[PDB]
Amino acid sequence: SKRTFQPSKRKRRNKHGFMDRMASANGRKVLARRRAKGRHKLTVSSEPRHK
Amino acid sequence: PRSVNSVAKRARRKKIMKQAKGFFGRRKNVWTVAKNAVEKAMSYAYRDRKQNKRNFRSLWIQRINAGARLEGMSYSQFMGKVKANGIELNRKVLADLAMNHPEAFKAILNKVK
Amino acid sequence: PKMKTKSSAKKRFKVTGSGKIKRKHAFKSHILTKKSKKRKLALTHSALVHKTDEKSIKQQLRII
RNA sequence: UUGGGCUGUUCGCCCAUUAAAGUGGUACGCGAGCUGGGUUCAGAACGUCGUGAGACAGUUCGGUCUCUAUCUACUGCGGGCG
RNA sequence: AGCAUAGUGAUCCGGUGGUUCCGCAUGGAAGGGCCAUCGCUCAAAGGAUAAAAGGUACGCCGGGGAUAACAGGCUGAUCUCC
RNA sequence: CACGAAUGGUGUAACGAUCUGGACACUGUCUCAGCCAUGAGCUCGGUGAAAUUGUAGUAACGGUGAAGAUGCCGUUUACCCG
RNA sequence: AUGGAUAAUAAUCGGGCAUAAGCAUAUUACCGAAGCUAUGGAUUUGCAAGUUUGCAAGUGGUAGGGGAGCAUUCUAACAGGGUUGAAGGUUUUUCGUAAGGAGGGCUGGACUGGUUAGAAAAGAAAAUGUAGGCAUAAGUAACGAUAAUGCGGGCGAGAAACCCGCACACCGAAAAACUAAGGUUUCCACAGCUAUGCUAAUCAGCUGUGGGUUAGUCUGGUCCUAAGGCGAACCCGAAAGGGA
RNA sequence: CUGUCUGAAUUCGGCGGGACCAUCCGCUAAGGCUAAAUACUCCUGAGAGACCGAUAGUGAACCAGUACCGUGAGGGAAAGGUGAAAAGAACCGUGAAUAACGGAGUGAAAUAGAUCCUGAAACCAUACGCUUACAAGCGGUCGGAGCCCUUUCGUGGGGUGACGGCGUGCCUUUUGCAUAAUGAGCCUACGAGUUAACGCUGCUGGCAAGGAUAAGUACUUCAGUACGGAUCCGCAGCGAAAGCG
RNA sequence: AAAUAAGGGCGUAUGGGGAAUGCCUAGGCUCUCAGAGGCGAUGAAGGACGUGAUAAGCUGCGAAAAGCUGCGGGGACUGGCACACACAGAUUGAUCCGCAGAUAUCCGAAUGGGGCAACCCGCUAUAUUGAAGAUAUAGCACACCGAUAGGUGGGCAAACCCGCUGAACUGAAACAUCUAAGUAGGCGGAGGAGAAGAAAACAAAAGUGAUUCCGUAAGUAGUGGCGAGCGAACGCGGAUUAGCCC
């Protein structure tokens, strides 16, 4: 059957990207929390693009 | 300070497990099965000590009866005539005489009869 | 911290001179016209807290 | 110590035979043996009660029955020893 | 106070009469205190609030064989037989 | 007992993986089961789990017992291992 | 003593069995408990001697109450032990009412600990307790579409599965070709069979080394815009902010 | 202090002294600034612990907010030790093999060989000694031959034990459990009445109609003697209170 | 060679397995004393991509890229974890330490426009065939004020403090007043502290003289479905002491 995760590398960036987190006032607190915890990987935009 | 009873914790159970030597299966090496078997063994050993004193008297009485019925008597009559004669010999010595010294036993019987 | 004294028990239950607790009587509030004058005279003088309630009253007054 | 019609039925009535179509117990025997037709799951409707949410020893349609047998108990077959 | 045993309701709060008892610098007053007394089918009558009814078959959590439905057990009221 | 007129009453051609009763053809649904093929199963070679598990050298009958016994009582039966 | 029906797995004086080994009365001896006594020992209160002894009464025990203590880790003083072998692990002997103490042999190769006083992360057998390791079920289920395999050569130590060849079978509006989404090197060659492949493998989408993607015309940007987003100015809202 | 409305006088004025009024007392609103003694640690330098020692101590002693899980917010591990020094096993043999092993050299040790300090228990096997194929059940206990080792030589010790008697595990909850009521596969490690403030009883100690300091201060060899009487309890109680004692 | 009961039970010895215990520390925990309490448009915190004779990671550093310069200290080794085969530098005084400087790619407040962070695309001045395809350097966001050359602020980040908002579980053995609690949470600003601070104040017939903090006063007065509960002030003893401007 059809599962819940149907990947799309533009629907992913339009919802969880760096420019989508930095646009909101409360979405900008996720970045602060992750930098305070020390996450090596920030928002999904940290995944490398195809080269 | 942090206190851990690690060495004596096992040194205490080694001594209780060393007396479960010869038990069938895991009753000799497994701790929670050996401890449950050593305590029951000690409970069985506390009793049977009151029963060793009344299981040997039965054997003595049977041997005295056997040795007395060889002379046309019974244990009841023999013990009656012995107790009402001023003898005062316990059943252990009487059975030892009836088994090892039949001459002494028949001498006692003829003296009390 | 410091043990707080119960106000309901501190407004009543005056402690006597040596070891007792003095209190008032009840039933003398609003139906006094049909009770005999003997009962109303007996229920007027102050009474003492019984020894069965003394422990609770002392625990409330913070005298353990 | 029978086979059918009616009913989920036990029971019961009826039809045709038979020498006979017994009474009961075994967790109203037996669901790690079978079916789920009835009953007590969630949907919907009728009669009635309750203002209402809802309910009925009232009725009707539909609706997942899990497990590789260790010990003993049975049905069969072998090895060891005496 | 009635020949005697029933005719009853704690506390809080509020009302009335008496009282240089106190009355927040002093003098009064507001108010409080003491005595007498009034207001509760608080009737679930030792009265948890001044103020209070139902459904759950969509239900959920914590426990009970302390407690029912099936089966077992004791006894036959009922049943069957003599 | 306890239908009833827009929480609509009574009929209705066509329609319905709807419910109910009956008829023809047809058949293993059945009387009543029988034969055959492949996969699983069985034996051998390779790899190799899980649920479950207080210790166990783990019988039957009548009875007792927290009222239904592998472990208690009396009797009977049973060579050891698969 | 006799007749007065009995329940469903095979039954009963407990059984054998008994004509007394049944019943009624009387007598004697004996058996019979952790009861009583005889011997040894320990302990609690009360009474005396002292600084333990003697006597009397005791000494089952759940909820619960009281009193004496052991081990563990660390600290303060005095006194110690150890490479001629410390702690730890494994056996053995002995002592105490017990918790426990001390000694010997073997492994082990650097710390340890007596007396008095003190502190506490101060003791597990159960919480369908937690983490790690290891058993049982057991060499059992299973080895993942019933489209199918057979033979001969090659490398090789090793071939039912690898390579080659001849046969057989299956799909064929597909199990064929391109390619979007997506994956992001899995692509190609050579070495390897350790782990991975539900088996072995000389094989591989696995491991290690060397390579591989070439655009004026193909797909996107440099061109345009829809739904929708942002939005100076402007209008609202405790703030963040909302509308546009 | 004000969301809304209303709204005063200027020093013989205005406000406060817990409703309010008169007298006394104090102050002078509708303007502003101001160090010290006080709170904390993303940090910095020095130093301690009757603090932990790898399931402990931070989630993280080690390529840790890592590997893994989710779309995302987010959750979140396990993982220390050879040896003094790599001197980390040249070389030979079996083997297809640089799989493993047996030798040979290093070392004090290779049964310290990289799964490397010592290394227990569960668990899986081999050798030796004694028993076991007519015998029914919490597997033990009390008696008891026979056979193997040791020996101060013994009414001494150790191992196995033919045969007989008795005996229905443990915990919890219950009037009552072998119960067919609950729970546990086993072993190792962790795991549950502790501390602070304020009180009360029992024992002990100092002073005694008196007892004790708190904050703080001074000196010093510094998380460790003197001073400090503010204050608390007791010494007299009764009454709602004035008050009396 | 031996033994043999197919196998099982018990005891001893020797093995595999595993990681407990013992010892140790590379790391942590609670604090004491004295400081400091910020970085950023001269471009922050946090990253991406690069940089080595050899280079997969970590560390350091940015196209001047395991480094450059100046002043002091220091005196034989050095080219980080990192060794090995090497190759070089260095008593003319290297390596290293302290302080002060230079360079400092791209993203990120990101600030020339846009965007799917580490990308794309520009305008004006100059130079390069200059001309199409393109390049090298400089300047190009917004708000305020400065009259004008130009200055100030955007953002990030532990706790303390201030202001604006602000629950419920819980307790009352139920519950609505009450408590929990002006707590948790959300938003904005500043400093090493912040707030407060100089009487339209207390007190009572005697008096004190700004604020803050510590001990008593005191679990007192009082408040409360007068229930649960909440709970001052005066006065006294101390640390410090400071008063001024419209």
- Is residue B40's beta carbon less than 7 angstroms from any atom in nucleic acid strand F? no
C-alpha distances (whole Å) from C41 to each of B26, B71, C21, C38, C44 are 85, 104, 21, 5, 5
Using only the alpha carbons of chain A, give its radius of gyration.
13
Q: Are residues C6 and C61 in contact, defined by beta-carbon separation less than 8 angstroms?
A: yes
- Judged by C1' against the alpha carbon of B38, the nearest nucleotide is H140
B22-39 burial by CB neighbour count: b if 16+ within 10 A, else e?
A: ebeeebeeeeebbeebbe
CB of B25 lies under 7 Å from some atom of strand F: yes
Taking the C1' atom of every nucleotide in all shown strands and the CA of C40, the nearest one is E36
* 3-class SS of residue C21: strand
Determine whether the distance from the CB of C59 to the nearest atom of strand H is below 7 Å: no
**CA B105 – CA B74 distance, rounded (Å):** 14
Q: Which nucleotides of H are covered by protein (CB under 7 A)?
A: 50-53, 56, 59, 64-67, 70-76, 121-123, 138-143, 159-161, 165-166, 169-170, 186-190, 197-200, 236-240
C-alpha B95/C-alpha B59 separation (Å) is 9
The separation, in Å, between residue A3 CA and nucleotide F18 C1' comes to: 34
For residue A3, say whether its CB is under 7 Å from any atom of strand G: no
Residue showing tokens 């005999």: C36
Q: Report which residue type is found at C52.
A: T
Distance A44 CA to G150 C1' (A): 57
The method of structure determination was cryo-EM
For B12, the enclosing helix (H) or strand (E) is: helix B6-17
Between the CA of A49 and the C1' of I128, what is the distance in angstroms? 36
Chains that touch B (3 or more CB pairs under 8 A): none
